[PDB]
Scaffold this active site. Structure first.
Site, PDB file in Angstrom:
ATOM      1  N   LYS A 258      -0.917  -4.553  -3.113  1.00  0.00           N
ATOM      2  CA  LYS A 258      -2.099  -4.016  -2.407  1.00  0.00           C
ATOM      3  C   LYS A 258      -2.350  -2.575  -2.835  1.00  0.00           C
ATOM      4  CE  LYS A 258      -3.674  -2.764   2.247  1.00  0.00           C
ATOM      5  NZ  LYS A 258      -5.120  -2.990   2.115  1.00  0.00           N
TER       6      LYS A 258
ATOM      7  N   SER B  91       0.772  -1.191   0.000  1.00  0.00           N
ATOM      8  CA  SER B  91       0.000   0.000   0.000  1.00  0.00           C
ATOM      9  C   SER B  91       0.852   1.314   0.000  1.00  0.00           C
ATOM     10  CB  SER B  91      -0.936  -0.119   1.210  1.00  0.00           C
ATOM     11  OG  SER B  91      -1.846   0.959   1.257  1.00  0.00           O
TER      12      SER B  91
END
Length: 386
Positions: free
Chosen positions: A320, A295
């Site tokens: 992600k 992320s």
């Protein structure tokens, strides 16, 4: 139109407007809305809640869920108590057959200690099969009374056979976002081409939270001040957390150009760019990443790579890249919805693809502790970072 129907519609609308995929997973969002209004019982708040939940499910996006006013609030009051966990951050699998997996095994935590690795599939939590459950539901399973225990069964991805049954003791896991050092007498295998000196600055960002920024800033300032010959930015096993921290870090290193794009099925909706205010734009940089790099961390890595600011070494990252937000209802309830996707400056999704290393290396080779780190770098089997 009743109050209850009006509430269901706020929920439906929240998705209608914000959803990442305007084809709604091949469903007629509008048709659903009307159908539900005619077919689903909604005379009592509790039933309207069931309806929203039923509605959200058709999208087939595990990250998209409805949250009741109390749970939302409690999410919010969040982190605090004697409520403890097992050093595990979770997410779903990068290509959803279903699966809840380990995102981050917190440094030096119970789970971590037990061998849980990023990417491992969680089968059960105390006998209950977690597949398809909300991450909120799962967090609750793993959470509990201080110093108490919980049984987590996991397996390596693609090997449901190869399982391990973890007996974990629940305990607060304090974590530090940033540490750094200067390694001296660095082996040459480890120095960037033409290093005036055998010294590398090493910066470890184990997490992206509210403290990351200040600590990272300070670190890069000192190291630059020392004139190290190269920088090693270690974002291995860093779940990403706070997006803004990731962007602030990237601005420290990249002084111009785009850093990350925010896209949906419409096109690009937003973008974050360099603000020119860097700390160090010149020292050769290598960024350590691994499968647990996710992320906000991947956003950082992507920006560093695409801009040519630094090389990426290790193994491909988590992949992600979805962005969820909570839309609040009049209720005080909310809809957590996937609304966008991060893409690198080159226009590539982070989701599924992740960031790829320039220098493929065993991500295990280097320690995470300062002493150990300098030790491996200043040695006969020091990784060829650059």
């Amino acid at each position: 139109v009743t109050s209850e129907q009006l509430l269901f519609l706020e929920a439906w609308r929240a998705v209608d407007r914000a959803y990442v995929d305007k084809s709604f997973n091949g469903q007629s969002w509008f048709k659903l809305r009307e159908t539900y209004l005619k077919k689903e019982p909604m005379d009592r708040r509790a039933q309207t809640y069931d309806a929203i939940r039923k509605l959200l499910a058709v999208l087939d996006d595990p990250f998209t869920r409805f949250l009741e006013p109390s749970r939302l609030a409690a999410l919010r009051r969040g982190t605090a108590g004697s409520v403890t966990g097992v050093g595990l951050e979770i997410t779903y699998d990068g290509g959803s057959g279903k699966d809840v997996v380990v995102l981050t095994p917190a440094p030096g935590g119970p789970a971590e200690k037990a061998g849980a690795r990023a990417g491992d599939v969680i089968v059960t939590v105390d006998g209950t099969a977690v597949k398809g459950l909300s991450l909120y539901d799962v967090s609750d399973l793993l959470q509990g009374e201080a110093d108490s225990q919980v049984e987590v069964v996991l397996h390596a991805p693609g090997a449901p056979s190869n399982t391990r049954t973890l007996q974990l003791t629940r305990q607060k896991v304090t974590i530090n976002p940033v540490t750094f050092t200067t390694c001296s007498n660095v082996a040459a295998a480890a120095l960037p081409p033409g290093a005036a000196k055998q010294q590398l600055g090493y910066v470890r960002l184990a997490t992206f939270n509210s403290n990351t920024t200040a600590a990272a800033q300070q670190a890069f300032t000192e190291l630059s001040k020392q004139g190290v010959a190269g920088l090693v930015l270690d974002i291995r096993n860093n779940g990403g957390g706070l997006f803004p921290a990731g962007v602030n870090v990237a601005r420290m290193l990249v002084d111009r150009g785009d850093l990350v794009l925010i896209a949906d099925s419409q096109g690009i909706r937003d973008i974050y760019s360099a603000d020119g205010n860097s700390i160090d734009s010149a020292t050769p940089l290598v960024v350590l990443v691994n499968r647990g790099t996710a992320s906000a961390s991947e956003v950082l890595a992507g920006a560093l790579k695409d801009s040519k600011r630094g090389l990426i070494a290790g193994e491909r990252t988590f992949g992600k890249g979805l962005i969820q937000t909570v839309v609040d209802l009049s209720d005080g309830s909310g809809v957590a919805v996937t609304v966008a996707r991060y893409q690198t400056p080159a226009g590539v999704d982070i989701n599924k693809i992740g960031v790829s290393p320039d220098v493929q290396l065993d991500p295990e080779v280097l320690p995470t502790d300062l002493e150990g780190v300098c030790r491996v770098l200043g040695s006969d089997a020091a990784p060829r970072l650059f």
